[PDB]
Amino acid sequence: MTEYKLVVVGAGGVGKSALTIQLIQNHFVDEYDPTIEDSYRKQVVIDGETCLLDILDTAGQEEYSAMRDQYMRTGEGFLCVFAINNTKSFEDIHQYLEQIKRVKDSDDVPMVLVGNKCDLAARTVESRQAQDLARSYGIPYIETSAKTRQGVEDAFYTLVREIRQH
Ligand X SMILES: Nc1nc2c(ncn2[C@@H]2O[C@H](COP(=O)(O)OP(=O)(O)NP(=O)(O)O)[C@@H](O)[C@H]2O)c(=O)[nH]1
Helix, coil or strand: residue 19: helix
Q: At what angle do helices 87-104 and 127-137 cross, to 10 degrees?
A: 10
41 and 55 in contact (C-beta within 8 Å)?
Answer: yes
First to last CA, the chain: 17
35 binds Mg ion (CB under 5 A): yes
147 binds ligand X (CB under 6 A): yes
Q: Annotation-wise, does 119 bind a ligand?
A: yes
Site string for ligand X, 33-72 (x = CB under 6 A): -xx-----------------------xxx-----------
| 117: partner contacted, choices ligand X, Mg ion, Ca ion, none (Cβ within 5-8 A by kind) | ligand X
In the list 4, 6, 15, 75, the residue contacting ligand X (rule: CB under 6 A) is 15
119 binds ligand X (CB under 6 A): yes
The values of phi and psi at residue 120, to 5°, are -85, 145
| 102: partner contacted, choices Mg ion, ligand X, Ca ion, none (Cβ within 5-8 A by kind) | none
In the list 30, 33, 62, 107, the residue contacting Ca ion (rule: CB under 5 A) is 30
Q: How far is the CB of 10 from ligand X (least distance, A)?
A: 6
Neighbour tally for 44: CB within 10 Å? 16
User: What is the rounded distance in angstroms from the CA atom of residue 157 to the CA atom of residue 146?
Assistant: 15
Q: How far is the CB of 32 from Ca ion (least distance, A)?
A: 12
| 119: partner contacted, choices ligand X, Mg ion, Ca ion, none (Cβ within 5-8 A by kind) | ligand X
Helix, coil or strand: residue 85: coil
The values of phi and psi at residue 56, to 5°, are -105, 120
